[PDB]
Amino acid sequence: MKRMLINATQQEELRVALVDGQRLYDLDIESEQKKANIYKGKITRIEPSLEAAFVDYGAERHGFLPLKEIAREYFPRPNIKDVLREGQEVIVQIDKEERGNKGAALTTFISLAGSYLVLMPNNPRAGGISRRIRTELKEALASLELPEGMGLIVRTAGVGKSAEALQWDLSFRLKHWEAIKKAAESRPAPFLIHQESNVIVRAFRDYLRQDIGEILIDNPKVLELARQHIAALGRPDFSSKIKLYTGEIPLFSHYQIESQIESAFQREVRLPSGGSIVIDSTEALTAIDINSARDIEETAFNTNLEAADEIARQLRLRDLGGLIVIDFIDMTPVRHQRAVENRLREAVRQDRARIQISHISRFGLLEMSRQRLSPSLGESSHHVCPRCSGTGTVRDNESLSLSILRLIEEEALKENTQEVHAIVPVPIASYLLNEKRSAVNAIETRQDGVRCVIVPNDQMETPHYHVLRVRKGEETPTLSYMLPKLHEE
Amino acid sequence: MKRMLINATLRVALVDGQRLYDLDIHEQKKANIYKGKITRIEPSLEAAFVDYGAERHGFLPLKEIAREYFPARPNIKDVLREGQEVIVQIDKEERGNKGAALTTFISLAGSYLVLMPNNPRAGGISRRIEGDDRTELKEALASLELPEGMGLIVRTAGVGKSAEALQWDLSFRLKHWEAIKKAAESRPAPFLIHQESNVIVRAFRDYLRQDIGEILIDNPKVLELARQHIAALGRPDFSSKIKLYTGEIPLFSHYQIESQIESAFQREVRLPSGGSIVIDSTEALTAIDINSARGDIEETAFNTNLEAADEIARQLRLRDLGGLIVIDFIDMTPVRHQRAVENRLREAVRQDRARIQISHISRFGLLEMSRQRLSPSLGESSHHVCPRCSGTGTVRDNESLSLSILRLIEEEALKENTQEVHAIVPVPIASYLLNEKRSAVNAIETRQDGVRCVIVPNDQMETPHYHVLRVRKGEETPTLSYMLPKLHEEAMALP
Amino acid sequence: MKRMLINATLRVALVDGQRLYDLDIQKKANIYKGKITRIEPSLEAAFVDAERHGFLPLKEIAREYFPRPNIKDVLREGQEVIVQIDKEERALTTFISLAGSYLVLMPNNPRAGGDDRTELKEALASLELPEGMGLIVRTASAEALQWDLSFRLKHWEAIKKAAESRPAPFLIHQESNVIVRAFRDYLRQDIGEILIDNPKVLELARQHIAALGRPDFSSKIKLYTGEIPLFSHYQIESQIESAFQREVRLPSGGSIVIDSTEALTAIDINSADIEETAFNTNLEAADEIARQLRLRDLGGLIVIDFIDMTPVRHQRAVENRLREAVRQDRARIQISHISRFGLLEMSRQRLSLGESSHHVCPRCSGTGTVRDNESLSLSILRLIEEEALKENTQEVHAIVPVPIASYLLNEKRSAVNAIETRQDGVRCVIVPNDQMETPHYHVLRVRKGEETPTLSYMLPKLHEEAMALPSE
Amino acid sequence: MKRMLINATQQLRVALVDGQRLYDLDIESPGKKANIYKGKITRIEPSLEAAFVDYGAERHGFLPLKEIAREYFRPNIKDVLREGQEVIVQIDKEERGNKGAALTTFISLAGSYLVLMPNNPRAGGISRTELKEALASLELPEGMGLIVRTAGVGKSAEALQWDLSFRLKHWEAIKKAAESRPAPFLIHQESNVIVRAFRDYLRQDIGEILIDNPKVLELARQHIAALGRPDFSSKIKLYTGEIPLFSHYQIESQIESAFQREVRLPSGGSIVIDSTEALTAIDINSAGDIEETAFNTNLEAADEIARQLRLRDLGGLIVIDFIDMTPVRHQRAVENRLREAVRQDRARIQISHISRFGLLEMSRQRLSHHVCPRCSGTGTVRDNESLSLSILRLIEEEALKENTQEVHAIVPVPIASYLLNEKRSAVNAIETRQDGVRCVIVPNDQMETPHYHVLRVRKGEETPTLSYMLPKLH
Ligand SMILES: [Zn+2]
Ligand SMILES: [Zn+2]
Incomplete structure (x- = not known):
């Protein structure tokens, strides 16, 4: 049958x-x-x-x-x-x-x-019969x-009928x-x-x-x-x-x-x-x-x-x-x-x-x-989907990383910079600090004296991150992994 | 130049x-x-x-x-x-063992x-070339x-030169x-x-x-x-x-x-x-x-x-x-x-x-x-494509989603020969189901006399994804609720 | 009564x-x-x-x-x-x-x-x-x-x-x-x-x-x-x-x-x-x-x-x-x-x-004692190098708790680099693994030829059957 | 050999x-x-x-x-x-002091x-x-x-x-x-x-x-x-x-x-x-x-x-x-x-x-x-079972108190799972015996397994906050 x-x-749904x-x-x-x-x-x-x-008409x-x-x-x-x-x-x-102003x-x-x-x-x-036919x-x-x-x-x-x-x-x-x-x-x-x-x-x-x-x-x-x-x-x-x-x-x-x-x-x-x-x-x-x-x-x-x-x-x-x-x-x-x-x-x-x-x-x-x-x-x-932040595209771990990497370097170039802290999700810190370790070293050696800190934070997921600049003099002796808390402020 | x-x-x-x-x-x-x-x-x-060296x-x-x-x-x-x-x-x-x-x-x-x-x-000229x-x-x-x-x-x-x-x-x-x-x-x-x-x-x-x-x-x-x-x-x-x-x-x-x-x-x-x-x-x-x-x-x-x-x-x-x-x-x-x-x-x-x-x-x-x-x-x-979306930009709310899983659970429990039904859901979904909707979870179990409804929070999933598994009479294990995601690991897997 | x-x-x-x-x-x-x-x-x-x-x-x-x-x-x-x-x-x-x-x-x-x-x-x-x-x-x-x-x-x-x-x-x-x-x-x-x-x-x-x-x-x-x-x-x-x-x-x-x-x-x-x-x-x-x-x-x-x-x-x-x-x-x-x-x-x-x-606490062996990260890292750091020295080694994967990876790859980044440079051609991969806590870790050796193009953060899963314990 | x-x-x-x-x-490191x-x-x-x-x-x-x-x-x-x-x-x-050896x-x-x-x-x-x-x-x-x-026992x-x-x-x-x-x-x-x-x-x-x-x-x-x-x-x-x-x-x-x-x-x-x-x-x-x-x-x-x-x-x-x-x-x-x-x-x-x-x-x-985080520096961590049972008695003790509207148990994920499945019956039993008291057990993937919280909510202070949003609120 x-x-x-x-x-x-649900009398709305x-x-x-x-x-x-x-x-x-x-x-x-369904259900102007x-x-x-x-x-x-x-x-x-x-x-x-x-x-x-x-x-x-009413x-x-x-x-x-x-x-x-x-x-x-x-x-x-x-x-x-x-x-x-x-x-x-x-x-x-x-x-x-x-x-607008116009009635139906x-x-x-x-x-x-x-x-x-x-x-x-x-x-x-x-x-x-229709033209589309x-x-x-x-x-x-x-x-x-x-x-x-x-x-x-x-x-x-009506066509297959x-x-x-x-x-x-x-x-x-x-x-x-x-x-x-x-x-x-x-x-x-x-x-x-x-x-x-x-x-x-x-x-x-x-x-x-x-x-x-x-x-x-x-x-x-x-x-x-x-x-x-x-x-x-x-x-x-x-x-x-x-x-x-x-x-x-x-x-x-x-x-x-x-x-x-x-x-x-x-x-x-x-x-x-x-x-x-x-x-x-x-x-x-x-x-x-x-x-x-299978x-x-x-x-x-x-x-x-x-x-x-x-x-x-x-x-x-x-x-x-x-x-x-x-x-x-x-x-x-x-x-x-x-x-x-x-x-x-x-x-x-x-x-x-x-x-x-x-x-x-x-x-x-x-x-x-x-x-x-x-209609x-x-x-x-x-x-809104959070991970894609509204658009249906999620940035590959490659390119995200590369994007933060250019972003870190742009912070290290700035005058009066002592350190730069990248607080990233765990896979990104893994990809940055292994696959991209060479480039991370390249930044620090080109910005002689600037500390690049890339800290894996299991409290974030993969669209989100942070790149913070630490001016000369305001650096603390905080441990790399205890920073995400430090910057909690 | x-x-x-x-x-x-x-x-x-x-x-x-x-x-x-x-x-x-890559050496x-x-x-x-x-x-x-x-x-x-x-x-x-x-x-x-x-x-050769x-x-x-x-x-x-x-x-x-x-x-x-x-x-010659x-x-x-x-x-x-x-x-x-x-x-x-x-x-x-x-x-392995062979030389080159x-x-x-x-x-x-x-x-x-x-x-x-x-x-x-x-x-x-190779065969690839039309x-x-x-x-x-x-x-x-x-x-x-x-x-x-x-x-x-x-x-x-060589094709275009x-x-x-x-x-x-x-x-x-x-x-x-x-x-x-x-x-x-x-x-x-x-x-x-x-x-x-x-x-x-x-x-x-x-x-x-x-x-x-x-x-x-x-x-x-x-x-x-x-x-x-x-x-x-x-x-x-x-x-x-x-x-x-x-x-x-x-x-x-x-x-x-x-x-x-x-x-x-x-x-x-x-x-x-x-x-x-x-x-x-x-x-x-x-x-x-x-x-x-932006004729x-x-x-x-x-x-x-x-x-x-x-x-x-x-x-x-x-x-x-x-x-x-x-x-x-x-x-x-x-x-x-x-x-x-x-x-x-x-x-x-x-x-x-x-x-x-x-x-x-x-x-x-x-x-x-x-x-x-x-x-290479x-x-x-x-x-x-976003995996949370399939590239919609849109995700169901937790409420509409729980209610949906709710009825999905009950649909499984109503099947003949069902011993248990395991809902493996994201953590805030188990939270919502087993608190706000506890009454309704109870109602299922009491209407399906003898069918165990197990809603397990799984911090390995997030919110569009879930799972509803049916356990037939006689094939239930004495596994702990929170250890089911790891046991069903075998099955829940999408091709 | x-x-x-x-x-x-x-x-x-x-x-x-x-x-x-x-x-x-x-x-x-x-x-x-x-x-x-x-x-x-x-x-x-x-x-x-x-x-x-x-x-x-x-x-x-x-x-x-x-x-x-x-x-x-x-x-x-x-x-x-x-x-x-x-x-x-x-x-x-x-x-x-x-x-x-x-x-x-x-x-x-x-x-x-x-x-x-x-x-x-x-x-x-x-x-x-x-x-x-x-x-x-x-x-x-x-x-x-x-x-x-x-x-x-x-x-x-x-x-x-x-x-x-x-x-x-x-x-x-x-x-x-x-x-x-x-x-x-x-x-x-x-x-x-x-x-x-x-x-x-x-x-x-x-x-x-x-x-x-x-x-x-x-x-x-x-x-x-x-x-x-x-x-x-x-x-x-x-x-x-x-x-x-x-x-x-x-x-x-x-x-x-x-x-x-x-x-x-x-x-x-x-x-x-x-x-x-x-x-x-x-x-x-x-x-x-x-x-x-x-x-x-x-x-x-x-x-x-x-x-x-x-x-x-x-x-x-x-x-x-x-x-x-x-x-x-x-x-x-x-x-x-x-x-x-x-x-x-x-x-x-x-x-x-x-x-x-x-x-009895898994974190201790039932002591309450747990080595400092600093000491725990340095230990693993000498362990890693030991593996990279071995003949026929292509890569060495350290699978460590998140704060240990963080300590290793920042505070000890110099030394990690020193190993990689002295062991010309051997890859040190130190992967932060939020599935582990701090007494535990793994150091795995990858012989020449058997390396995969797996992502650093996906290694923990590739290595499951080979890094699990007869305890479970 | x-x-x-x-x-x-090394010194x-x-x-x-x-x-x-x-x-x-x-x-041997010599003082x-x-x-x-x-x-x-x-x-x-x-x-x-x-x-x-x-002797010199x-x-x-x-x-x-x-x-x-x-x-x-x-x-x-x-x-x-x-x-x-x-x-x-x-x-x-x-x-x-002053004496020679x-x-x-x-x-x-x-x-x-x-x-x-x-x-x-x-x-x-001997002896x-x-x-x-x-x-x-x-x-x-x-x-x-x-x-x-x-x-020389072992010689x-x-x-x-x-x-x-x-x-x-x-x-x-x-x-x-x-x-x-x-x-x-x-x-x-x-x-x-x-x-x-x-x-x-x-x-x-x-x-x-x-x-x-x-x-x-x-x-x-x-x-x-x-x-x-x-x-x-x-x-x-x-x-x-x-x-x-x-x-x-x-x-x-x-x-x-x-x-x-x-x-x-x-x-x-x-x-x-x-x-x-x-x-x-x-x-x-x-x-084999x-x-x-x-x-x-x-x-x-x-x-x-x-x-x-x-x-x-x-x-x-x-x-x-x-x-x-x-x-x-x-x-x-x-x-x-x-x-x-x-x-x-x-x-x-x-x-x-x-x-x-x-x-x-x-x-x-x-x-x-x-100090080992996980057992607070003693020999022992509890079973998820015994821990749960422990929180369970603790939840009830809070619900008994006069002027209680709700009791929130913020537990690790496997605990919330064990409580709200294996112990669901007992969780119901508390709520039904404390007529009017809401027992909210919330899984929180931010904690692990020795730690937890049991908070008491007096009549009139309860908000319309969602169960899973309670960790943040608190
Ligand atoms: Zn999406
Ligand atoms: Zn301990």
Whole structure:
């Protein structure tokens, strides 16, 4: 059975997992974003000067509706003064967030994005397959039963799919649209109809499919809200599937996903056979290295296939974006390289994100790209990494040392210098005073009379250090290792 | 003017003429050349033993003796006399018990050429060199004046130079080879003729070309050794060009190269126009990102990429970067820019001695390339991915992290047949779990009646890392809590 | 009065007046009535109903249940049977064995039974054992044995009475609940009361007594109710605290010092007529040491440095004191003489696994003395050079404590350089290691050819297997 | 080959070395008593029944009548001695205050095991069953007597004969050097630190004595002739290499082994030398056949222990926990191995067997830095268990106090681990019995294992500080 588990025992913090069995196969972790919210709005005032109008959609500031955005449905080359009345009600969607002094950009041409489809129930003039894409898709799109007054777009996401699966998405957009206009026809004008960005409506919109057997929710107050959204989205057949979790063992722990979730935070994730993948992220790209466990050709082939599967889901769970480079283990047969490519392609087939994959090159690398799905490059409860001090780069022991070494010498050059104390972490004092002993001696012999003291301090770690200057006369007879305390002041 | 500055108060920098364009900064024997006397012959091993000086005798198998020592499949007893003198090179250093592998087939490696003055049967362009590169090299090599009884090899390094530049390299090997057999004809048998690895001998062997005007040296004791090496290498035309630096301002500071040397240790290197390159290194490869400055867009991207290609080439030399390199060039829409950026990189690396191979800008806008670190020294990549992060700059809080491990613990304890669950966590995590969350740790144990939850503080880990191990019924040991990290040492280990 | 105090607010203390003389702080050998699930002539065994069925091989069926044969001939499916667990779930026998302190009754089967043994072979022949059964005398007098043998017989009766009174699947006897063990190990005829401070436990305590088959005792189990804690009211809490001290004061004023080393436990004896003092303090020591061995649960080898005595008759009297003082200890104990050096060597078998109170400082060899860093460095510094002089040496790695590396590579940097320069080509690597402290270090020699490009600070790990100690 | 190496380039160390096994060391560093002179009788005092002797000090020595040998003879001192009479004289007591030194013509030559009184036979004997048998077997000249030292517990008769004869050879040379000169000079210097080494460390099997210092080597030969053995002058040799003597002979590390707690054995096992209040416990760990390994490590142990006792100068009571051996014949062979290997030692040694417990007891007579952080300078550190239990009772005692809100136990990491796992139950028990009192046990990687803290937090003073942030706060 496929389940959607929703762990919501922090009422600010929120987790949604899809699960075939114990395949965690997709995850999301959530809760302002306002783009693509739908309101009923009253027209505040008309401006023939800007060929536009102003809409009270509930916000403290009025939205902005240009003429090019008004549907023929609301037209009772024309002046806007001839098209709209003041105080006229209108179903309105946000194109662009409020910026600076400027109210949100609003359009009546409403668009309902699904997983694979974007229904424009309001205008039929937009539609077709995307530029980014198509032979079977042009055949599958013509087969869907679309009402006459509307148009649809098939998202890059729609490409490895079937027509049967598209009809399921298209109909979920239709049921929603009915309810949008049903909840508009039922009220006075200033209110909100659809929230793009709250986590239940988004979870159902993105994560629901026909193969989903249950939706377990561990919080009653939420489960009630979850029902309401399902009827507003126009799918009662799902209410029966929504079920309340009540056990005292936590939802995600009862189903054994909490560790799999934990794997999306790790540098190294283990593969089923015993190998692993190491996910490093640079300024330019994300590098994924692959290591095997403890026939060589069969091992490399086997570990790569597992790697291809793990990388795929890690890309979903982590929500990784941009450029990705996979260093697959070397394989001599070309047929293996194809099978490792085709593994990865099938594994990323279920990913909603726009993903593009090349081959295994002559250097044994695979390049690919993924579009990060959410605007919020953000992390619910985190802090700056201390060791890298916020940037993701840690200075090699070589260069750190070399850097302090030039820094010591610059202090020894200064006039009136008696001594210079470098208080460094232990490995650095080890590297400086052995590997670089020659250069340490070179400084002291060139700065005749200047004491270079490099003291290993097990109280520091490797980004941190100190280089202190001791002027002629203020030197003490303190022992090298008792200095870190001395300079505690 | 081009100078070779040598700071030895050992660092060697090539300076045009206040710009710094190349830098160079283990008791070595492989590829030393001796005159040797034959100690004793072994027809049983089809080999002989040679006294080249060392406390242990070298090993010269029959397959290594040149026809120069032959008359007309023979027994080695018919070939050599005991105590017969012979010019000998070390193939392989002394390992364990054996003395050193020796061959009479001498080879003199230059920058671009390896002269085998001893045997003509082994020369040509190597297989590493792709056809379109080699095409002109097969033409340039046929044009060099090589004496009859000897053969050459064009190193992968030869790849970007000209026939006029190769003729300069080949002649330096010839001048040396002469002196090698002149110093051998002039003495009894047991001595050393050529030392492969003086940093002076190496610097001249690797870094001299006809375009080098001066060789400033700031150390007298070394300058004298430098002249001797020049005469021993057989090039008196360069003695005049070796000069003593004397100024009180350090050699490298007078020429303003010290900061440029400092750049080979930086993560981000400013380009001339304002943009930069970010050199990150990972486990697998070296990622280089390119950023631009501050207004034609296409021109900026093109122009920044060109500067990048030039900076990356020299940084690859100065850093001595090895292995796999991925360059993320700024995106360019015209294909003609993408070829120009590639060709910029090819012409910029053309003077690197290292074997370099460069592909195209792919559909993703990446350039893959490889480079051999030249030095037995294993290269430390200037910077690299933070291990606490994986290079996010972000780390989970201790609370969210404990709560996460909490449920992870309980998930393990709920598994059938579980006796114990061991959480090996960083010290402040065990502190938080076993104090602030003690109640909840107790709740697990009391709900999983019989399952021991062991949360052990481990001062060997820090805060993103942890471990949650499951102990099945019957395989628990009476080990103390604080001694579990050391016992699980075996397992918890990541490939 | 001898009491058994049970603090369960689980600790069990045997207390004579106000003297603490003993202290205590799985499914093998549990007994059930079981129904035979199904028979297997193939494995010559049967299955007995836990969520999983037990396994009863033919060799384990008593002659009592057979009304060389096949297992299908002996047993009927669904036949009830008194069953004991031989081995935990990873084995059932119908030979049952009831272990006491001194005796293991095999009430089912008499083909059992088991040269300090001279009086034991006589004492065992004197016990009144029913015909159909045999017994084993554990490693742990005849009058004291008859008390133990009868408590097993009382128990066995109740076991077959609780089986004759019910349907077939249930548990009869639980081998291991600390109350069962305390009554099994720590009950005797001379125990007047068993005070318990916890009602929930006292109730469980009574049930275990009737199950153990001794209703005469229920009267002697009493509930403690005072607000002053049970152990404090009886003044044993300090004596319990003495089991954790290095030095325990003797009645007369002398003391014993209990040190423990790697090999053994050294007990020294100090005092407060010289001959009479030594003799008398030694007698007091033999008493204290005996009960300290019980309270601490000390195991293995014990050497006792008694105060020296010149008359041989005192030495025997101090031995025989110690022998009779340990007589009540459950553990297997063996005692030798006071040797010509005035030591007494003895051994004790720790009853369950465990360790001791104080042992000897790793930092010293047990002195308190520790060489100054200056002297310690200079020592290592001459040691390093000694290694670099050796023929065929490529490198020499000093792995020293952090302050020693700091002293060596700063204050003594000149000398370190002097070694490297006089030993042309030999690398001195002095690595600071925050895993060591200051008496300890290592100086390792790296022959020509076997050097690795390992980083100075990573050597400690590369050298683990070769720098570890046969001590551990 | 057994050698005596003498390092004297440094201002003096003497090491007995067998092959390259340092087995004895002396570091005599010289700041009285038993010097021998030829002396002229300055003046006689019948008043004090004594005389005055010129032994060449600026002050005359004092020779009572009771100290004059029958050889030089109730009488007056005036009747026995003639003024200006020459006499072989030994110092009894160093010069004190105004008096000159006490002198006796009863002369005694101390060796390692024997004191020869070549002058008087009336003093000697014991106070042992075999020593009384062994002393009666020695060939001692009529006119003289001998004492067996406390050392001489550990002498064979053949070994005693070697000591006695070295005293006799010396005594001959003493009177030979007296007969050959006028009267005021010094004959034998007891104390000049080379004399001790030759007196304690020389024997017939010493091939060479290498000395790295000329000034000292000259002094070393004079002392040999004065000790009366010119046959050795040829065996004393000047070391000259730039490599220090003790480093050329590879013994400097073996000298440094005497300071360690564990010493590795040749085969790979080791011995652990731990010293308590009562005794020295030596434990033995091993590195195929198990019976052969245990036997073979124990043999090496016995050998190593023997010389460690010598190098360390351990004294008193020693208990050796040999690796268990089931065969009784090995037990005897490990015993006999120890006995033979201490046979060289100069100290008084006694050895029992391997007991039923597998332990060997033995005693040795001793022949002649800064407070440890970790045990506060006593013998003992606590077990993590006992320490934890100790802190645990201490935590509860703080929680009992009136007006307590919290009790913070700042312990080392392994202690926090043991307390909060193995003892978690008891930690809960305190908190639940002290309703409302928070027990905070915080692991602190800044401390190690003897140290800790238990702090009390009164009601109202508690902060919202995180557990692990409490070390810093405090
Ligand atoms: Zn980081
Ligand atoms: Zn200590």
